[PDB]
Amino acid sequence: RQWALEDFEIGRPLGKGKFGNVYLAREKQSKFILALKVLFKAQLEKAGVEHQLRREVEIQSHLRHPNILRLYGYFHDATRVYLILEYAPLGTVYRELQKLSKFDEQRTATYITELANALSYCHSKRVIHRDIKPENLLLGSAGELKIADFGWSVGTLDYLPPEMIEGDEKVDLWSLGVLCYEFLVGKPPFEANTYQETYKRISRVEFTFPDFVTEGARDLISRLLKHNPSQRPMLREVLEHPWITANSS
Ligand SMILES: Cc1cc(Nc2nn(-c3ccccc3)c(=O)c3ccccc23)n[nH]1
Numbered sequence: 480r481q482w483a484l485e486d487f488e489i490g491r492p493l494g495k496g497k498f499g500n501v502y503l504a505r506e507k508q509s510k511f512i513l514a515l516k517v518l519f520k521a522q523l524e525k526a527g528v529e530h531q532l533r534r535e536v537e538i539q540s541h542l543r544h545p546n547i548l549r550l551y552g553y554f555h556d557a558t559r560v561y562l563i564l565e566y567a568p569l570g571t572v573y574r575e576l577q578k579l580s581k582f583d584e585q586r587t588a589t590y591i592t593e594l595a596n597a598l599s600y601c602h603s604k605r606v607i608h609r610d611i612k613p614e615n616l617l618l619g620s621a622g623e624l625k626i627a628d629f630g631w632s633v634g635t636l637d638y639l640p641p642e643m644i645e646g647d648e649k650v651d652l653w654s655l656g657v658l659c660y661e662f663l664v665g666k667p668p669f670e671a672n673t674y675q676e677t678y679k680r681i682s683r684v685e686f687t688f689p690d691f692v693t694e695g696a697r698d699l700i701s702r703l704l705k706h707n708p709s710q711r712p713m714l715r716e717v718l719e720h721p722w723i724t725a726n727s728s
Contacts, residue, residue, distance in 0.1 A: 482554040482563060487515060498523055499559075503566065513551065514564040521558070532560070535629035538606060546597035548617060548627040567625055569618035576613060581665035584693065588727035590616075591659050592718065593624050598651050599714045601631075607647070610634030611654045613661065636677040637667045641706050644681060649708035655717065656703030663696060664689055668704070695722030 490503040499517040506513070523529055539550040549565035569575075572590070576582070582590075594611070601608055608631055615628035636644070640653040661667045668686035671677040680686070684706050688697055699720050705711050717723065 480552065482552055482561075484556060484561065489515065498528075501564075512566055514566045516562040516564055518560045518562070519558065520555070520560055523560070532629070535631055536562070538631045538633070539629060542601075542604075542606070542631075544597050544600045546593045546623065546625050547600075548625045565625070567617035567619050567627070569620070569622060571614060572616035572618060572624060573613035575618065576662070576665065582662045584663070584696065584726045585728065587659060587662040587696075588723050588725075590624050590662065591655055592723065592727045594626070594655060594658070595714055595718050597626055598655075599718075602648075602651075602714065605633050606631050607633075608651055608654075610638035610640075610643075610650070611658065612638050613658070636674060636681065637669060639681065640708075641682055641684070642708060644678060647708065649711050651714070652703050652711040652717070656700050659696070659703070660686070660688075660700050663692060668700075693722075695725070698722065 486508070487504045487506055490505070493501045493503050493514065495501075499519055499522075502515045502517065504513055504515040505511060518532075520529075523532070536550065536553060540552075543549070548567065551563040551565070553560065553562045555561070598608065608626075610630070611626065611628065612634055615626065615630075617625045617627045619625055638654060638657055640650050642650065657667055657669075669677055669680040671680055684704060686704070688700075699717070699722050702712055703717070712720075
């Protein structure tokens, strides 16, 4: 099932930078709408990332869940790698957060639920996921989030757990705690001005809450941001948390 750049029509650029941009696209024969992610080869071999792509791709091609961005295929040419992706038309949770400043209790619980499901589903298939940033969280036609990064296996400090910065399975839970906080306060709990300092804050687990944060949210966030992995809830217990069930559509 060889795809080629001539089976598509490329349209408006959707987002940019680094390895290469993402263009909106439609397959000529069927008229299917989707996303083309373009990546210059040479420029990725020279960052030594070449190989991890093939694996995250292999991993993704067999992944199917309504809160995980679909990967339909890929192909290469002389110079370039192209990924054929599901298209999510409401943009990123990141840009939504910039627009609204901060989400409300209802939207947060909803997203955390949709993510928790997508991560339960992942674990069953012995797939485990690294850090999760809002940059990599897209929204579908019905406003539902989709995990859109290529970071699996069988986050410029902010989203990384203490395990990955000092010396699995529980990394996910830490991720939900960071995202859950950021949703309600509008910036991640360990944001600092330098790498050096963010590293100290995460390593020691230094955060405080603004005064608008209801006790229920404090209680969930504090359970998930524990230095020791084994003290973190299982995904299940997060799905059934008093504050979650009360607020999650
Ligand atoms: C992979 C994918 C993207 C997408 N839709 C979009 N992606 N990205 C984006 C942001 C940063 C970097 C790359 C793309 C967008 O800003 C965006 C904005 C409005 C509507 C849709 C999208 N659907 N599927």
